[PDB]
Amino acid sequence: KEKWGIAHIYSSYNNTIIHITDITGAETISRWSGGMVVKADRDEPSPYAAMLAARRAAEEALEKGIVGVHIRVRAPGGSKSKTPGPGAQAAIRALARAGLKIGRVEDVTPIPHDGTRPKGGRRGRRV
RNA sequence: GCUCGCUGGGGAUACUGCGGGCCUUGGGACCGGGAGAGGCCGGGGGUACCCCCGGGGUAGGGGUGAAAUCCUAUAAUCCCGGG
Ligand SMILES: [Mg+2]
Ligand SMILES: [Mg+2]
Ligand SMILES: [Mg+2]
Ligand SMILES: [Mg+2]
Secondary structure: OOOEEEEEEEEOOOOEEEEEEOOOOOOEEEEEEHHHOOOOHHHOOOHHHHHHHHHHHHHHHHHOOOOEEEEEEEOOOOOOOOOOOOOHHHHHHHHHHOOOEEEEEEEOOOOOOOOOOOOOOOOOOOO
16 A cells, blocks of 8 residues: 655754654654764754755655655744744755655644743843 | 000991701712623633653754753653553
8 A cells, every 4th residue: 555654853943853753653764863964063953954864764764665754843842932943844845855755744833821931031041 | 657466335248157948960879781801719621841651763962152061872852652
């Protein structure tokens, strides 16, 4: 038939993580981050690092029989920033280029209905 | 003229004071259909977050203007099932 999986993309201002699981999520097919493809901390969240990691993960997934994925992309969320970093969309485009079919795309950033207090004080970072 | 102050009497009744009568306009009481994150007490929920147990997977995660302390093979970051 068609073996379909899920691509979980975690994108912040400091790094990017691309993690492919099966359709239920309980089994890990492949997992690559920005620090595994570059040597400098400054380049970890760049679009090019996201492309490289997505390509490695997609190749490992294709060798094992995955044909397509559905995509779940998230920023850190909670009491941290709600906006994804610059690597998410580059990672999305690279998966399709490497040979995977793409299903539905959704954002799953966790959002509180008035949760906890964030760091920094009532004055924030002072730079 | 000044010591603008005191005292014996006579007259007036507009205003203020005091006594009696009569009002409803200010204020208060009550009745009707509605408005509101006003207050107190009891019950039922919402996501988010932290810790613990079990499954997967394996070398990094976190963080800055740039780094380091810190966390991680006693298996982290990430994903799934529960408390
Ligand atoms: Mg790193
Ligand atoms: Mg501090
Ligand atoms: Mg300064
Ligand atoms: Mg485990």
